[PDB]
Amino acid sequence: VARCLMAEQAYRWETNDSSARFIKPGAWQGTYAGLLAGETLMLNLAQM
């Protein structure tokens, strides 16, 4: 998650939009032992 936020800052500095965010919380679900985070992060990297 830290490295994906690094990439999001790189996107926010390449093109000029500070308000535009892509990484949303809720990818980790502790009540189900955190299964399926890779899907959410891969989808969100695809959106970026």
Binding site: Y32, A33, L35, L36, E39, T40, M42, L43, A46, Q47
Partner: protein
């Protein structure tokens, strides 16, 4: 009489197995949640591809 109390022991054992299959971690609700979440992510990723 011993046959009857043996059958009641079998019934209580069946109740124990059913409570185990409900209260264990990977139960049916887990797979329902996974299939829903994975289906939504899969459809959106299909559109991007």
């Amino acid at each position: 009489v011993l046959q009857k109390t043996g059958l009641k022991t079998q019934q209580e054992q069946t109740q124990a197995q059913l409570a185990f299959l409900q209260r264990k971690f990977s139960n049916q609700a887990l797979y329902n949640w996974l299939r829903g979440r994975l289906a939504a992510i899969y459809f959106q990723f299909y559109d991007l591809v």
